[PDB]
Amino acid sequence: KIVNIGAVLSTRKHEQMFREAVNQANKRIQLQATSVTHKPNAIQMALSVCEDLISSQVYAILVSHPPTPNDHFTPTPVSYTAGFYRIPVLGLTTRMSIYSDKSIHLSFLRTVPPYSHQSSVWFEMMRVYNWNHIILLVSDDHEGRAAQKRLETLLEERESNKRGPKAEKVLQFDPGTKNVTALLMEARELEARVIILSASEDDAATVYRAAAMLDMTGSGYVWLVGEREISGNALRYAPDGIIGLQLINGKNESAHISDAVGVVAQAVHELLEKENITDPPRGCVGNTNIWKTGPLFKRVLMSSKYADGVTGRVEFNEDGDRKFAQYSIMNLQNRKLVQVGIYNGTHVIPNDRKIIWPGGETEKPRGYQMSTRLKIVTIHQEPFVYVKPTMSDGTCKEEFTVNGDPVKKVICTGPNDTVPQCCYGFCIDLLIKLARTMQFTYEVHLVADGKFGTQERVQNSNKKEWNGMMGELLSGQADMIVAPLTINNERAQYIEFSKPFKYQGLTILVKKRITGINDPRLRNPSDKFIYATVKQSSVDIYFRRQVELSTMYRHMEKHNYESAAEAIQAVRDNKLHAFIWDSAVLEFEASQKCDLVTTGELFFRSGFGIGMRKDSPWKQQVSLSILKSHENGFMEDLDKTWVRYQEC
């Protein structure tokens, strides 16, 4: 009818006052406490648990008895043994979720809640900051990686108005490295100033050090770091205007361990408040199995809550680790902490004085900033872009129009089979309409693939994804590129593309029957009838979705030409019946050279395109921009500029 609990404390006062409050709340059907020290050897704490707790039939122990040299205090295998009896255990020794995970440690709690909600409190706290674009990286590790995971769960929480919990970029680092200078270059590649990371204080010293070297730690980058990164020796390397945080009243075993006594009492009377309330067997040796009621007692721990404790009102968590904590924010004042205050679940405490941003920034700056030059890549589209070899100095030959206007070819760089060049085409003219709307420069590259990209499963990994520069747009390699291509569900599957005002067409061109594809002459092409399209083309997907594609796609896969330019070759060569290509582009080619007679059929008529990946100002800018494009004569211009360029 009395509680018997062995334990292991950090200091004598921990054990004595432990038994003291144990008496006090034991009155608040009686209970007492017994504790040990932190046993130096691993086996010392081990058999120590096998006796002082076990032989005591120990109720529970809230255990932090570190040197406070971090270390994620060893007694994980201890609470394990508590599982060997299914006896209760609650971690006092860690602010990491390492002490959380049940598959590792089932019975456990946190007087220092897992750092998960911490940076999440920095997430909703960024909603307070009202920041949007935010990028993140950290060193390779389970707690770190999965920490970023849970952060994404916070981001994933917003899944179900204007903008939102914008995730800028997710990077990662390895554990224990010196130079992030590559990832620093990624931060350069990061437009957003929001810097989300977590580490220890010394790796954080690498962060502010090499970051300042990259001028990342320089003013103009909003650094949200981890407490372990923030607190500690990093104070020497502390970034200017940076802030750091920790939960309210966490590090003091006085109020925190006192709270362990109080909630321990809520679970004592509560421990006496359930059916078949008792204590587990004592002897470790002599216990070969887990206590069934001891496990049921842990269910009571899942049922364990407290009205108000020594730290005040606190409940359990999903992990049962504390609850409703408050992380005290401290702004920098002359490289010294000026406390903003504690952000509870609902509550958040700003400072009295204005907090210091990393620089002299009064408010959170605007992170996302697009580049003036937006790199582009494509293959010459005879419909618009004709890329000629430039001058010996790379200059382009000044070329008047039929009207006489000295049209401007599009300077470019392209591969060896690397070389710069220029391109005469109406596409870059539409680009001049683009920068003409909102100024955007660009860097032109080439595209050697079978399309923009072709969703494709490679010879390895069987990974089906766009094969071509389209992945590089998914990769954003070229910042903003374009191709006069029709969109596909694959693009839909890939990313939102633009809507070109151009109206394209898709059919096969023949040299100059010849009915539609379904026509038996075409549907059953004879030996004399050979036809194909470019390998890995978009039409390759088109026919690649069809009932009869066996003959067409399959049988033509033999006849399939890799290069569409090569299809023009064998086409004018008339080495085959007809050539499947873009019927629009066919009209462009039939325009310049009528030696091929294109069909008159109508299939897959969409239009041109430009590089569009997820959120871009080109969303509405480019959308309504096109609305003007067709809405203005620039459309009719291209007609004149291109369609009217057809003599025959």
Partner: protein, 87 residues
């Protein structure tokens, strides 16, 4: 009204949507009315049935378009409703 007008020619010509000129194009009693030109593109654009502003169906309905082009029954009804009498 303007259609039978132009049929008689009550005005020099009848302006209308190239779509109006499409359904109007194929179906005709006799052969008189013709497109502006052969029907060359005048204000190239396209139509669809939208929804509430920033509706959640946005990406979804987008996929519905991916089924439209990814259908080819567009060609079917493109006969069924949209086959013209002129041809």
């Amino acid at each position: 009204d303007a259609l039978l007008s132009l049929k008689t020619g009550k005005l020099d010509a009848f302006i209308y949507d190239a779509a109006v000129l499409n359904y109007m194009a194929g179906r005709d009693e006799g052969c008189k009315l013709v497109t502006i030109g052969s029907g060359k593109v005048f204000a190239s654009t396209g139509y669809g049935i939208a929804i509430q502003k920033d509706s959640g169906w946005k990406r979804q309905v987008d996929l519905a378009i991916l089924q439209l082009f990814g259908d080819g029954e567009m060609e079917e009804l493109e006969a069924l409703w949209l086959t013209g009498i002129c041809h």
